[PDB]
Nucleic acid binder design. Structure first.
Lengths: 114, 92, 197, 150, 58, 36, 22
RNA sequence: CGGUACGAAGUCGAAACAAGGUAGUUGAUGGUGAACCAGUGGCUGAACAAAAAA
RNA sequence: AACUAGUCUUAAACACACCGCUCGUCACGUAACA
RNA sequence: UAAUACAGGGUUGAACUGUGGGUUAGUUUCAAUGCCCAAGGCAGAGCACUGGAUUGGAUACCCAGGGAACUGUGCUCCCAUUAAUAAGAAUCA
RNA sequence: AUAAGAAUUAAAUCUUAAAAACAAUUCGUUAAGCAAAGAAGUAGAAAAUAAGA
RNA sequence: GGAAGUGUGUUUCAAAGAAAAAAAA
RNA sequence: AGUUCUAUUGUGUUAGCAUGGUUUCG
């Protein structure tokens, strides 16, 4: 089963932290028999509102990352719990990849008709 | 959310009236009154049924009154059923 | 009882070494080994595994390659669906609608078996043998006595020994009261099920 | 019938206006570059109006209410009390040196009187904001109070 | 739209008129009853005005 | 149901009939419950 | 009401006294 | 024993029918000289009030 | 903003028509069941 | 009623199938609140009860406080018991 | 005692009080339990329920 | 972090406030 | 009608989350 995960790291997060988190996620995928498909960086984006992350602070933007992976359905709960426990991550969401409207295929001309 | 209005080259009374209109069309007072006190589920069922039955009638009668006012203002006459087979040809 | 339930759940959870839907060697060769692993049944969901098992039963008991409506194949698929729903209920014991769905499917399977018995007796016996389900016979009309009546629940009782029988529990047959270790007296509404012979 | 808060009047320490208000490190209550917001909280029985300096981290400067203007008991429910509170706020703003303010409130009832008093007494209004903070979770997430008269 | 958690099933004509969009009488079903016609006899009701019967030809 | 529901409405059954629904005043059922 | 508020007031008073002592 | 039906109209209140002056009634309850009252969940065999569109 | 006369709408268990209809305890005799 | 996991049902199409059904007790899965039991136990609100008023008078309506009840594969189906006035066939373009 | 807050048809109980940390109003921050406000026309298939007053 | 400005990537205030009313200057 | 697959899921049970009335802390 294919899935896409979107993460929003804070400014305090570093490249080393991102690499560590991705390594942990790939370890979970391999444990659940899956395989990481792709990883991409969607740039720095301002939040629609200030994120008050308790015991971490207040943030006004974040760096957005995306990774797509095929894995057994049982891995999603573990991945979600791990991402929630991670400190730097501000927000995360994992969804089932769709045939047409997915970042792997429907990745260009999402706003420009011509 | 909270509506923000700028009182610039206008009357504070007019701006307050616009804010009141926003509140009325958003049902803010209705929700505040609802949450000020406990409403049992059956009462809510009856109220929602009543509203869903009532408001379309009000909208239709509002449209009818708008048409009546327009016709009175423009001195319009009552219509006659369009007779078919009328050539509708210009007298020229 | 608990051990039998655990055995059934484990057997249902077992994942064989095969792929999903109808992918085969040439289809899977084009992809990379990682994506082929993603296709493999280990990554597959419970629905895909259930569909694979139903496909295998169909290929076993089918008239021809695409025969899925013949009463034998219908019996196999209904049995598989009943087993899948029973496992799902053992997990989500609070899902009430699925018990109703299970009862409906038991009735449908009973009707399919009744039809196939008359239509083709030898094939009916063969299908029951292969499915390891009780080969109920409909030579004469069933009875109104629950001690003699057919049990669509008791069918496929080889898999689950807890779906076999139960002691009478109404009126004079109700279980008697027992004093527990805590010192309070409790009466069971049902007789604790004993392993059938 | 003093027209004010009896206890504040009695305990007034020599009557220096704004004697008890903390001041900046420069010794000024109001900087020449400060903006002001009047927050009004209305209800059936009373209206609480607070003038706040936005520049000083939205810090309350002074406030007024029915007791402060000298209205007690049932008289606090009428529109006269709301207009009196508005007049008091406008006059004190004029004394301090506040001319233009931004209005904010949660319940819109009993706010027209305050706005009219402000306009009459020269307290200009630059903007109006209605912040009802309506529930965004449900209607009985916390069981509200029982309905009166059963 | 709102979520009332179920619907209501009143039986009386009064409550049905209150709680339904319209209670206009519809055309009779051609499979059940005949169509209304101008020749149908009028109801046998005495003409009354403010409770007084108006029964006099002159 | 006519006389039966009349007895239910006037409350004779409420007094004289056991109820697996229990209640603090109604007679209770000490046996496993089944639809009759 | 008048139970939780009183209990929390007493709790805050005790906590402040203890912290000042410490 | 407790309850129940008939005749009589006596004392005490005014529970229902109008928004019956606190909508009614219902399931199982708690409380009360009486009708009844209170909470909770049901119904309507209830009312009042009731949107134009930015 | 209130009142009377209307006039209109709605509700009604009122129709001798709200000075209506109507509930119950207690008291009071004749009885059946238990 | 966001995503995710596990299961239905409905709708549309292809294939399969070939009167294989309509109704249903000596049947039993589920089912508001309350009550019994178990859990927890002070976010809110809230019987009994307390005391602040109105009333000849209230054991109520109003106000303040409130240890009963408010989340369970348990016990369990009383009802103004859940999409209606039982389910199916026929009559209509 | 008293005023203020709160409430009420009007009052009272209740909370704070003498320069304020939580009576009430404004501003931040977490914490706790709880969870149908917003998005679906019972409308339009000819589709229609009960002789009368 | 609050409030602002434009020779700038600038300045200012700043980790709770609030203790008659009505005026003069 | 039924079985299989197909596209869709304001259906039922689900670990966790975003938001919010209320109370709370300063």
């Amino acid at each position: 089963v294919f899935y896409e995960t979107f993460v929003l790291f804070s400014k305090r997060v570093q490249r080393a932290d991102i690499r560590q988190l991705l390594k942990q996620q790939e370890a979970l995928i391999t444990k659940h028999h899956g395989s990481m498909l792709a990883v991409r960086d969607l740039g720095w984006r301002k939040t629609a509102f200030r994120v008050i992350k308790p015991r971490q602070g207040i943030f006004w933007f974040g760096r957005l990352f995306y990774f797509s992976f095929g894995a057994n359905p049982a891995a999603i709960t573990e991945m979600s719990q791990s991402l929630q426990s991670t400190n730097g991550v501000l927000r995360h969401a994992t969804v089932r990849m769709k045939k047409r409207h997915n970042l792997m295929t429907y990745n260009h001309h999402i706003h420009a008709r011509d | 959310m909270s509506c923000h209005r700028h009182v610039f080259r206008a009357a504070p009374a007019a701006v307050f009236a616009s804010v009141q209109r926003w509140g009325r069309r958003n049902n803010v007072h209705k929700l505040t009154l609802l949450v000020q006190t406990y409403e049992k589920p059956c009462v809510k069922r009856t109220r929602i049924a009543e509203e869903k039955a009532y408001y379309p009638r009000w909208f239709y009668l509002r449209y009818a009154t708008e048409v009546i006012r327009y016709s009175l203002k423009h001195h319009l006459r009552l219509g006659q059923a369009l007779d078919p087979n009328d050539d509708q040809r210009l007298d020229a | 009882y608990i051990e039998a339930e655990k055995e059934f759940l484990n057997e249902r959870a077992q994942v064989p070494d095969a792929y999903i839907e109808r992918w085969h060697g040439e289809d899977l060769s084009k992809l990379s080994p990682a994506l082929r692993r993603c296709l493999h049944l280990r990554c597959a969901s419970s629905k895909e595994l259930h569909s694979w098992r139903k496909l295998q039963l169909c290929r076993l008991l089918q008239r021809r390659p695409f025969d899925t409506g013949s009463p034998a194949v219908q019996l196999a698929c209904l049995t598989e669906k009943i087993l899948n729903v029973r496992a799902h209920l053992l997990r989500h014991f609070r899902d009430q609608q699925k018990k109703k769905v299970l009862s409906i499917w038991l009735s449908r399977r009973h009707r399919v078996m009744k039809y196939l018995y008359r239509v083709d007796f030898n094939l009916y016996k063969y299908v029951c043998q292969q499915l390891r389900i009780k080969c109920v016979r409909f030579a004469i009309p069933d009875s109104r006595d629950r001690q003699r009546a057919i049990s669509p629940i008791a069918v496929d009782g080889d898999r689950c020994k807890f779906l076999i029988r139960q002691k009478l529990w109404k009126a004079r047959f109700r279980p008697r009261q027992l004093k527990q270790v805590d010192g309070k007296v409790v009466r069971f509404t049902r007789h604790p099920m004993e392993q059938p012979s | 019938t003093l027209g004010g808060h009896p206890r504040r009047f009695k305990l007034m320490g020599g009557r220096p206006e704004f004697h008890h208000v903390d001041r900046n490190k420069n010794g000024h209550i109001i900087e020449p570059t400060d903006k002001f917001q009047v927050v009004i909280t209305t209800s059936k029985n009373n209206v609480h109006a607070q003038v706040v300096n936005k520049s000083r981290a939205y810090r309350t400067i002074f406030g007024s209410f029915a007791g402060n203007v000298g209205i007690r008991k049932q008289a606090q429910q009428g529109t006269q009390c709301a207009y009196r509170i508005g007049q008091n706020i406008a006059r004190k703003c004029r004394r301090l040196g506040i001319s233009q303010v931004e209005i904010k409130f949660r319940r819109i009832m009993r706010v027209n009187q305050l706005l009219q008093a402000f306009t009459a007494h020269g307290l200009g209004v630059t903007a109006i904001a209605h912040e009802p903070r309506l529930p965004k979770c449900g209607q009985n997430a916390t069981k509200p109070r029982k309905r009166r008269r059963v | 739209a709102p979520f009332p958690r179920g619907i209501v099933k009143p039986r009386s004509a009064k409550v049905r008129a209150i709680l339904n969009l319209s209670v206009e009488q519809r055309q009779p079903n051609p499979l059940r009853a005949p169509r209304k016609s101008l020749l149908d006899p009028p109801p046998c009701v005495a003409p009354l005005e403010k409770g007084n019967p108006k029964l006099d030809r002159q | 149901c006519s006389d039966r529901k009349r007895k239910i409405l006037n409350g004779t059954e409420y007094i004289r009939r056991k109820s697996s629904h229990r209640g603090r005043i109604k007679r209770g059922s000490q046996a496993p419950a089944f639809k009759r | 009401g008048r139970s939780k508020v009183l209990i929390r007031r007493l709790k805050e008073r005790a906590k402040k006294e203890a912290e000042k002592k410490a």
